[PDB]
Amino acid sequence: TSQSRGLDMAVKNANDGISIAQTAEGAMNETTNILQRMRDLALQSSNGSNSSSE
Amino acid sequence: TSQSRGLDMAVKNANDGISIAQTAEGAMNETTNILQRMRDLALQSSNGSNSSSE
Numbered sequence: 001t002s003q004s005r006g007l008d009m010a011v012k013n014a015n016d017g018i019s020i021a022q023t024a025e026g027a028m029n030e031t032t033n034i035l036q037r038m039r040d041l042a043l044q045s046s047n048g049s050n051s052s053s054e
Numbered sequence: 055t056s057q058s059r060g061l062d063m064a065v066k067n068a069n070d071g072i073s074i075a076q077t078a079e080g081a082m083n084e085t086t087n088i089l090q091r092m093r094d095l096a097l098q099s100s101n102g103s104n105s106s107s108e
Contacts, residue, residue, distance in 0.1 A: 002090055009097040016103035 045054070098104070 005094045006097055009094045013101040016101055020103055
């Protein structure tokens with residue numbers, strides 16, 4: 001009986017762990033998209049056609 | 055006839071002794087349930103998803 005209640009609280013606890021990892025990874029996805037955009041801009045600036053203004 | 059009355063006292067004493075055991079068991083049934091509830095609450099609290107407030 002104690003094991004059954006503990007197992008349910010453990011399943012709920014593991015759901016919380018999946019939730020925390022899900023939220024942080026989802027925010028991490030936009031970090032990846034930002035960095036790729038920053039890398040595209042950095043490559044563009046390296047072109048010799050750009051003057052100091054661009 | 056002397057100890058026939060004695061057994062009548064004996065069964066009477068045994069009956070109330072059974073009653074004392076029964077009420078002790080009955081109040082005990084709630085004690086077990088309270089401890090089990092505290093075990094689930096403590097189990098939930100051990101999760102790192104909970105902050106200090108929870």
